[PDB]
């Protein structure tokens, strides 16, 4: 099975900037069966390049495709608002077809660190057997943000969801919620609740935690 | 000058299977590979599968290899697709793609058309309000004069849901995420937003949400709490 990867996972850039994304193949192919989409905020995605290098009808001057063998490059040299998006390469050759993870093109910003908040479970949610515990990272920048839950220094895996806003049209932060959801019998039996940050604009990783009965 | 056509959004309960139509529109039907793809939630693009229409050409991704049914009907020129036992993987918007470009059959190549897509939903739930509650301002949601508060809205269904503050008067520093399909097939989201701390006791905070589907409307005013 060929497999792609790509690189990076956010790619920032300023309107007037140039920056190359980068498509690796697992194997090596011929660079007649790699394409690039583009998908913007909300509509289907669009063909860019064929064939690694071959533009398709329409597209701007400022999309590049190169490369051959394994390792495949897009490039935008004077991006416009309109090219903020995700792009992803894709194998069309063989029987079987293969995407990228994709790669988010965001709008550079200076560095700002995350606030963090953590709210307890109602009282109220607390009769319905349910409890969700929530963490918020507000306004920070860049979009790369590592969140831990950790139940009386217990790691939490699973029983988490994390959803991000888009970036923001004034100061192209992000805000991200993370919610723990535990039964009612699973949380009245521990007390210290507690998620941990990782980001770039914190120089050590904060932890904003409450006791139990406490709050 | 082909156009893509597809089927309406569908929610689907675990287990069963969803069929998907695509018509091609202004163009021929046997001569180009008509290639699905779909997008999960938040996840990257992945290829189900592709076929020549009766020409009979096709291959099925690996992992919905004995999932997958790919076939059409001639006299309608429309093709379908049909996935088998469906989980909460399946949930998605799947895409019917094509390239455009005497009479010969084609399968390796690029996709420039695209259907708008079909939204898939994997789950067993039927419509249902939300639940409101109060995501309560405390020490540890305040920090230097700013407290954070919200309200959480929790297991309804289908989409969407609004919320506001304060009737529409608080739009400053509001932060409403995207809804969430939890494990349990119904969806959630908070809405936040930044205060002055001390605006606690002075100011009144009201969330409003309205989950048309259900005709459930809520006003929850979120208090402060000791935490
Ligand atoms: C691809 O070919 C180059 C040149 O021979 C070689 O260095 C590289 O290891 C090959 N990689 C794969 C994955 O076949």
């Known amino acids: 099975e060929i497999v792609l990867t790509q690189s990076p996972v956010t790619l920032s850039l300023s309107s007037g900037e140039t920056g190359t994304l980068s498509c690796r193949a697992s194997?090596?192919?011929?660079?007649?069966?790699i394409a690039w989409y583009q998908q913007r905020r909300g509509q289907v995605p669009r063909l860019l390049i064929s064939?690694?290098?071959a533009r398709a009808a329409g597209i701007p001057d400022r999309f590049t495709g190169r490369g051959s063998g394994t390792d495949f490059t897009l490039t935008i040299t004077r991006l416009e608002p309109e090219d903020f998006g995700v792009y992803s390469c894709?194998?069309?050759?063989?029987?079987?077809?293969?995407f990228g993870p994709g790669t988010q093109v965001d709008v550079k910003r200076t560095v700002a660190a995350p606030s963090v908040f953590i709210f307890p479970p109602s009282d109220e949610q607390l009769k319905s057997g349910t409890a969700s515990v929530v963490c918020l990272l507000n306004n920070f920048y860049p979009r790369e943000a590592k969140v831990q839950w950790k139940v009386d220094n217990a790691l939490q895996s699973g029983n988490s969801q994390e959803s991000v806003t888009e970036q923001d049209s004034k100061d192209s932060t992000y805000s991200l919620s993370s919610t723990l959801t535990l039964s009612k019998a699973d949380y009245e039996k521990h007390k210290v609740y507690a998620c941990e940050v990782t980001h770039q604009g914190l120089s050590s990783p904060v932890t904003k935690s409450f006791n139990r009965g406490e709050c | 000058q082909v156009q893509l056509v597809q089927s309406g959004a569908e929610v689907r309960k675990p287990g069963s299977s969803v069929t998907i139509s695509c018509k091609p529109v202004?163009?021929?039907?046997?001569?180009?590979?008509i290639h699905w793809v779909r997008q999960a939630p938040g996840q990257g693009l992945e290829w189900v599968g592709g076929?020549?229409?009766?020409?009979?050409?096709?291959k099925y991704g690996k992992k919905f290899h004995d999932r997958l049914r790919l076939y059409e009907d001639d006299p309608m020129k429309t093709v379908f697709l049909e996935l088998r036992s469906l989980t909460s993987d399946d949930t998605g918007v799947y895409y019917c793609?094509?390239?455009?470009?005497?009479?010969?059959?084609?399968?390796?190549?690029?996709?420039?058309?695209w259907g708008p897509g079909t939204k898939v939903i994997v789950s067993a739930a039927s419509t249902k309000g939300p639940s409101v509650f109060p995501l309560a301002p405390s020490s540890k949601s305040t920090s230097g004069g700013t407290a954070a508060l919200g309200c959480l809205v929790k297991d309804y269904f289908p989409e969407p849901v609004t919320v506001s503050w304060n009737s529409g008067a608080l739009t400053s520093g509001v932060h409403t995420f995207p809804a969430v399909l939890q494990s349990s097939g119904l969806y959630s989201l908070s809405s936040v937003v930044t205060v002055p701390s001390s605006s606690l006791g002075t100011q009144t905070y009201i969330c409003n949400v309205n989950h048309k589907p259900s005709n459930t409307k809520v006003d929850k005013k979120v208090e402060p709490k000791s935490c």
């Open positions: 064939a690694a290098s």
């Open positions: 202004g163009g021929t039907f046997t001569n180009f590979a």
């Open positions: 194997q090596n192919i011929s660079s007649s069966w």
């Open positions: 076929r020549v229409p009766v020409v009979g050409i096709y």
């Open positions: 793609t094509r390239w455009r470009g005497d009479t010969s059959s084609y399968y390796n190549d690029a996709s420039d058309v």
């Open positions: 894709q194998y069309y050759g063989g029987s079987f077809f293969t």
